[PDB]
Amino acid sequence: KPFTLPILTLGELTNSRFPLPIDVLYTNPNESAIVQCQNGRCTLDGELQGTTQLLPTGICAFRGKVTQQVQDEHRGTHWNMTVTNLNGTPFDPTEDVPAPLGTPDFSGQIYGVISQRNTNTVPGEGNLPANRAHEAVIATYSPKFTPKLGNIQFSTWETQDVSSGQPTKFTPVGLASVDANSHFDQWTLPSYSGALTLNMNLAPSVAPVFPGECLLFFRSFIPLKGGYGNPAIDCLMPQEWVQHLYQESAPSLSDVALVRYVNPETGRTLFEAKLHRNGFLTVARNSAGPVVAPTNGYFRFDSWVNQFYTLAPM
Amino acid sequence: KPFTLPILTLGELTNSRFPLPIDVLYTNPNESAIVQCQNGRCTLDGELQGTTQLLPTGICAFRGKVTQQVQDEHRGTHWNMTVTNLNGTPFDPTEDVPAPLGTPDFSGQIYGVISQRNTNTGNLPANRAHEAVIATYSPKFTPKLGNIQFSTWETQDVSSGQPTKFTPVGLASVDANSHFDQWTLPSYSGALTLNMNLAPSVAPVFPGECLLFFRSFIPLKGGYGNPAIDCLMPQEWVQHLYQESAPSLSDVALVRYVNPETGRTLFEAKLHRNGFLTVARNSAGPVVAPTNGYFRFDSWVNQFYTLAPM
Numbered sequence: 001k002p003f004t005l006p007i008l009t010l011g012e013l014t015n016s017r018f019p020l021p022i023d024v025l026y027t028n029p030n031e032s033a034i035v036q037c038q039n040g041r042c043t044l045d046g047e048l049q050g051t052t053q054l055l056p057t058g059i060c061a062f063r064g065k066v067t068q069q070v071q072d073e074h075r076g077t078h079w080n081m082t083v084t085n086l087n088g089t090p091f092d093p094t095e096d097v098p099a100p101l102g103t104p105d106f107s108g109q110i111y112g113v114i115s116q117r118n119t120n121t122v123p124g125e126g127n128l129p130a131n132r133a134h135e136a137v138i139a140t141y142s143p144k145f146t147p148k149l150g151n152i153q154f155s156t157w158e159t160q161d162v163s164s165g166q167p168t169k170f171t172p173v174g175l176a177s178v179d180a181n182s183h184f185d186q187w188t189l190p191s192y193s194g195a196l197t198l199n200m201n202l203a204p205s206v207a208p209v210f211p212g213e214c215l216l217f218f219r220s221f222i223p224l225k226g227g228y229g230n231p232a233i234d235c236l237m238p239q240e241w242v243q244h245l246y247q248e249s250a251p252s253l254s255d256v257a258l259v260r261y262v263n264p265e266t267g268r269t270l271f272e273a274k275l276h277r278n279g280f281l282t283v284a285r286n287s288a289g290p291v292v293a294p295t296n297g298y299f300r301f302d303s304w305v306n307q308f309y310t311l312a313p314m
Numbered sequence: 315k316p317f318t319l320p321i322l323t324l325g326e327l328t329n330s331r332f333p334l335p336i337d338v339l340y341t342n343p344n345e346s347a348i349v350q351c352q353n354g355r356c357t358l359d360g361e362l363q364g365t366t367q368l369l370p371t372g373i374c375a376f377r378g379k380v381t382q383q384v385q386d387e388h389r390g391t392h393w394n395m396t397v398t399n400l401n402g403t404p405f406d407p408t409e410d411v412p413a414p415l416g417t418p419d420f421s422g423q424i425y426g427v428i429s430q431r432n433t434n435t436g437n438l439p440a441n442r443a444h445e446a447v448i449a450t451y452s453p454k455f456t457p458k459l460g461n462i463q464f465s466t467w468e469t470q471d472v473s474s475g476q477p478t479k480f481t482p483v484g485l486a487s488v489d490a491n492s493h494f495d496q497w498t499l500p501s502y503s504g505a506l507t508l509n510m511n512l513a514p515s516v517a518p519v520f521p522g523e524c525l526l527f528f529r530s531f532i533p534l535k536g537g538y539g540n541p542a543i544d545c546l547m548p549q550e551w552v553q554h555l556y557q558e559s560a561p562s563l564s565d566v567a568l569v570r571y572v573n574p575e576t577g578r579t580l581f582e583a584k585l586h587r588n589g590f591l592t593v594a595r596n597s598a599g600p601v602v603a604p605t606n607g608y609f610r611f612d613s614w615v616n617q618f619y620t621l622a623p624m
Contacts, residue, residue: 007557011401012368019333023401052328056549057335085603086335087325108549111443113427113483115533131534133484135445169533172483173427174443189408215437223429223479226440230431239370243550247321274338295401 001250003257003301006240011295013218013238016052017105017186019172020061020220023240025291027283029214032233033187038098038105039267040235041203042279043259046246049279050203053101054246058086060104060112060172062138062152066164070153078144078153079114091150096201099147099192106233107141107188109176111225114154116166134159134163136223137176140190141183141290148192148200178231194215207281208237209307216273216281217306219290231290236280244278248313252277254304261293262300268298271314274305284311315560317358317567317611319585320550321573325605327528327548330366331419333373333482333498334530336548339490340602341593343524347497348515352412352419354545355513356552356589361558362591364513367415368556371551372400374418374482376448376462380430380474390465392427395478397457403461404507410511413457420543421451422494423486425535430466439552440597442471445535447486450500451493458502458510465602467547484533486505498592508546513563516546516590526583526591531602546590562587571603572610580607581624584615594621 006013013022016038038050039059048054064083071077083100085091091100104110115133122128136154139145144153154170156162178184192199208214217234224231237245257275262268271291274282291314327336351365353373359423378397386392397414399405405414418424446464449455454463464480466472488494491575502509518524525546534541534585547555567585580603580618584592601624 008553014369014371018372022364045485054322055328055335057328057333061581090478091620113445113533115484115535115539117531125538128538128540130538131536133428133533133535170482171533173483174429221431223427223443223481224431225429225443227434228438230439240553243320243322243553 001248003250004248005259005299005301006244007298008240009296009298013135013240014056015059015218015233015288015312016235016237016239016242017059018220018222018233019056020233021220022218023220023221025286025293026217027214028220028233029286030288031098034205034216036189036202037236038203040188040237040239040242042237042242042245044050044245044252044275044277044279046249051097051099051101051103051105053086053243054243058102060110061086061102061111062170064168065166066162066168068164069133076155077157078155079233081154081168082150082258083147083152089103093148094152098199098201103147103192104140105189106186107190109141109177109182110138110172111174111248112136112170114162115169117173118166126201129219132161134162136170137168138260143195145190146194157276157302174225177227177257178224178229179227191199208282210282211283212284212286213311216283221257225256254306256305256307256309258302258305258309259299263294264296273299274309283314285314315432315558317338317568318558318561319609319611321608321609322550323606327550328370329528329530329543330547330549330552331546332530332531332543333370334543336528337531338526338529339603340529340544341524341601342598344598347496349501349525350499350512350515351546352499352511352513354549354552356545356547356555358555358562358585358587358589359476362487362556365411365413365417365419366552367416368399368553372416372517375400375416376480377402378478380472380478381477382462382474390467391469392463392465393494394461394463396460397462407460409603412439412509412511415480417457417502418450419499420496421498423449424450424482424488425484425493426480426482428466428472429479429481430473432473432476442473444469444471446480448480453505455500456504459504459541471579484487484535485541486535487558488539489537489578493548502570506519516588518592520592522596523621526593528624564616568612568615568619569609569616570612570621571607573604575606582621584619584621594623
């Protein structure tokens with residue numbers, strides 16, 4: 001079973017860490033943070049890792065039921081939510097995953113919409129249920145953010161119209177804020193079981209092992225509810241690569257696949273990258289910022305090489 | 315290049331007409347409406363049709379710029395926005411498509427979020443987002459002309475001339491006055507105008523057969539209802555067929571719905587060249603089967619092939 005990547009262009013790819021299109025390829029060699037995201041994690045032979053799952057709609061989504069309303073001391077409104085697996089089955093905290101698959105993998109205030117469709121139906125309404133939806137924010141750094149224990153909180157403003165004991169969906173849309181008090185850091189993991197407990201079953205950290213190489217990211221810009229900023233979310237591989245690798249189940253013949261970013265119109269290789277077995281890219285680049293490349297481009301598998309292979313500089 | 319389908323199970327598939335997971339397989343033999351949706355349209359040899367595009371994030375999304383606030387007889391505040399292609403390039407109305415790719419393909423009040431990130435800039439741009447509704451049956455819904463209208467709940471906090479994104483979430487309502495009908499196309503160029511460049515209607519050509527849909531339930535902002543959106547093929551099938559670009563060897567591919575755990579075929583279906591499924595079923599409602607099931611290509615057959623009843 002030979003190894004292949006999708007032939008989708010950048011404009012045909014989506015982010016595996018938030019429901020966003022891919023905007024640009026991106027590098028940042030001088031990043032000081034450990035890169036250990038948990039969504040968009042898949043080995044080249046198709047083994048999903050971390051909290052990664054296959055649905056584009058599952059990324060940073062939650063399903064469950066609300067239990068109680070609680071206010072904070074700053075007069076904001078919060079709602080306790082028990083969470084299930086995205087497919088509705090109970091989350092088993094002893095499952096060998098960091099958190100329910102799809103759980104956000106970064107610190108911040110995630111903005112979206114909470115919606116509910118009641119289980120009980122009304123005969124006079126054609127045996128149909130009542131519904132409600134509201135804007136909501138989930139603070140993944142909150143001590144109440146404990147998805148591995150089956151419970152999280154979300155916050156709303158100016159509404160009491162959230163029902164307990166009714167099926168609840170969180171649809172992510174963007175970030176609430178990226179100001180200092182909103183604690184946005186795309187490389188800081190949540191404490192999935194709370195502050196004093198160690199995260200478990202994590203996908204491994206990734207890094208270049210070679211002098212002169214840096215990580216290559218698929219970058220998306222993420223919407224903001226308000227305030228100032230131009231926040232971005234960087235993934236190691238787009239969601240369509242996760243879907244492809246999973247289905248193909250091709251044995252990895254070495255620790256590193258050589259790949260070429262090609263202009264199919266000219267047939268020319270624009271640059272080379274190392275696609276590592278654990279599912280991430282490195283390139284020989286000494287600068288930060290976007291990679292300027294034609295819109296028809298995509299990565300193509302060339303051959304299996306090894307860690308000592310020297311990439312041509314970008 | 316032999317023909318293949320993805321090996322993704324039902325619980326690993328998403329809808330091609332709204333950003334939702336697939337919940338169930340579904341039939342409705344006695345449907346009176348012409349089925350002619352424009353998203354999730356792809357021939358078996360990988361030709362996208364209608365307003366279909368490849369991004370899961372592009373389905374029922376819009377990109378553009380708000381131009382001005384508008385007043386009308388309805389509550390809430392209203393706004394005009396120009397719409398571009400999803401990749402930001404100007405929409406060319408002479409493109410041989412019904413509307414910008416990703417445009418909603420049904421009548422209703424689509425509920426979502428409008429967000430903005432200003433162009434001009436500390437040196438960081440300003441932002442805002444609000445819940446919004448787009449009435450696709452409205453005379454002001456003219457995406458083929460490069461313009462649509464949306465409504466917000468009372469707020470003035472929407473800026474003119476700034477990059478604007480619509481993220482779909484569900485429906486605002488399904489009451490009679492909200493005109494939800496998943497098989498009624500919008501008038502893409504406005505009232506009294508003919509739609510153009512449409513993907514063709516689909517139907518069973520065989521007695522006793524009916525369409526088979528991939529069904530998703532869609533969230534509601536309020537009111538009573540359990541609305542659903544039915545697609546002909548999931549978004550991952552569109553992605554797979556597009557890339558595979560495999561020649562269709564007949565008008566119909568015979569496919570088997572398999573339980574991979576047991577290896578047994580639960581039922582067979584016809585996968586038609588234009589990109590839709592039919593089955594031999596004489597009832598409406600969900601197909602009750604484990605979510606780990608999936609379709610597998612069996613062989614190329616013809617219009618005269620007789621399916622075993624489900």
